[PDB]
């Protein structure tokens, strides 16, 4: 219980890939993430890009320690694998939908574990790639993750949208529909 | 399903009443279980699962490791709060308020910070259904308030720290 | 003014 909660930061490393994630959060929102392959800090706001600076080397050094720590605890826990959780998907608009005026469709994918997910958009059954953005795996108090995917569009009576989510916790790929 | 071994390290800061109260909690998690942690209020590493004692005892025996973590209240928490005061804590985004029939819903979208007060007033009415505060994830919030409900005009009053005076939107 | 960050403590090898 506090006025402001910050994570400086969320350090993630998993055997599948292997893959990792470094990010800083403040009051439940992602400030920046470090692209581990590009060794680059990516701020999630123009205000942050102009004012704030973080050295990606510290993120990469942290993941190297996590890799060491994971291999030590794997041997300790007698090789205990991660339990796959069933994710919760919620689809909604950013602003009030009006025919002709540009809007954004938000796809909240909550309770993600392990942090390996495929979030894609389908317009009238056919796949869409243009104007698609995504957040990183945002942390939860119960040490699970949530990811939010976006779709910029032009609302019309001809287009119907679906948020396709693929996860190991699911038998069949989950599809949450949206209608204007 | 493929086999996966997940490791997480969360270095968290807890701020209360500006710079008066500062607390840090570092969490070491295997898969989903937090086996060891460091609470600035405790001052030492503590095992929180029988998977934690070899880690917690080793880190506490090393003086250089213990002192670095203790100092992380200043080198991380207090250092970054000063960077938040000039950026995040000064971010004020005015909300977009539009009344559309669905019942008349008051759409209060794209605002930051979370602090919001929306009331329907004609005099103030009681018996309104308000959805929980929605996080858009793009550093903006949205909230929708619906009311039960000739010649009378309905006004939606919205209070936010970004506005000196509330935005009044009528529906004749 | 560069951002500060927490360091993970190394597990005993």
């Amino acid at each position: 219980v506090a006025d402001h909660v910050a994570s400086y930061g969320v350090n993630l490393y998993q055997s599948y890939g292997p893959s990792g994630q470094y990010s800083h959060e403040f009051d439940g929102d992602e400030e920046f993430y470090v692209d581990l392959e590009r060794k680059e800090t990516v701020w999630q706001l123009p205000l942050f890009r102009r004012f704030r600076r973080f050295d990606p080397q510290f993120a990469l050094t942290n993941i190297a320690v996590l890799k060491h720590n994971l291999n030590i605890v794997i041997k300790r826990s007698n090789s205990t694998a991660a339990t796959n959780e069933v994710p919760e998907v919620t689809v909604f608009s950013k602003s009030p939908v009006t025919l002709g005026q540009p809007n954004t469709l938000i796809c909240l994918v909550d309770n993600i574990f392990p942090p390996v997910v495929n979030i894609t958009w389908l317009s009238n059954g056919h796949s869409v790639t243009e104007g698609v953005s995504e957040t990183s795996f945002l942390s939860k108090s119960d040490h699970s993750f949530f990811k939010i995917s976006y779709l910029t569009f032009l609302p019309s009576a001809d287009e119907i949208y679906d948020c396709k989510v693929e996860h190991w916790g699911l038998d069949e790929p989950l599809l949450k529909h949206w209608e204007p | 399903s493929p086999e996966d071994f997940v490791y997480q390290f969360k270095g968290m800061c807890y701020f209360t009443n500006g710079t008066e109260r500062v607390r840090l909690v570092t969490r070491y998690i295997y898969n989903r279980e937090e086996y060891a942690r460091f609470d600035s209020d405790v001052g030492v590493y503590r095992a929180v699962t029988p998977l934690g004692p070899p880690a917690a005892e080793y880190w506490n025996s090393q003086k250089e490791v213990l002192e670095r973590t203790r100092a992380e209240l200043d080198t991380v928490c207090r250092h970054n709060y000063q960077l938040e005061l000039r950026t995040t804590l000064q971010r004020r985004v005015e909300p977009t308020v539009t009344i559309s029939p669905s019942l008349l819903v008051c759409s209060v979208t794209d605002f930051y910070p979370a602090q919001i007060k929306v009331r329907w007033f004609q005099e103030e009415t009681t018996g309104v259904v308000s959805t929980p505060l929605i996080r858009n994830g793009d550093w903006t919030f949205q909230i929708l308030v619906m009311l039960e409900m000739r010649g009378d005009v309905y006004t939606c009053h919205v209070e936010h720290p970004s506005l000196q005076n509330p935005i009044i939107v009528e529906w004749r | 003014s560069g951002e500060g960050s927490f360091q993970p403590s190394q597990e005993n090898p």
Partner: T-cell receptor
Amino acid sequence: SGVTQTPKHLITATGQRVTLRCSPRSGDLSVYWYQQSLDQGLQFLIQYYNGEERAKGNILERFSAQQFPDLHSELNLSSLELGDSALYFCASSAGTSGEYEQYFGPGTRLTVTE
Amino acid sequence: AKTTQPNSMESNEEEPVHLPCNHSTISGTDYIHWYRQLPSQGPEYVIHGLTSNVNNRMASLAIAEDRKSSTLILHRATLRDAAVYYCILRDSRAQKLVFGQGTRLTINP
């Protein structure tokens, strides 16, 4: 200190290639290389942690290093120049975490001659 | 140079020495490290700190309230403590050590 280096001394001709060995302290995961020349003083070259490169200095392309599975390190100096005549110090720390002090080896004294 | 130190310092054996260091451009994430190098030897760690007075088995470190300066205190320097003392700024998360000119300490028998 606990850190050992081989050879202690080296006398090489210009254009030759040379390999410097280093053993960190027992338990130390991070290994480091430094050059101590009369012209530039003590200069950081490279750092390895658990066999992977973590930090780099103003290390020339001629210079290259490696950390092996037994955590021991090797520094390779190719196309040797008279200016490469320096003290090459090895160092090690328990880990890469910034609180860990560095323990230095006795150094390799290299003299490059025409 | 991130740190500035006097070039040389002379002292008597079995007497305290106060080695000063200026570092006005320090950051809230930087530590103050002190290393030394004895003649024909590899560098050796002395002490490191963040704020105020720091002590260990080898020395004391007095960091100024504004953190823009510090002092290394060798409580009883012997003839074996004659070395070059380097005052180094290093980020609390970094390992790379940047050695400047330093102070060459001469101990008089």
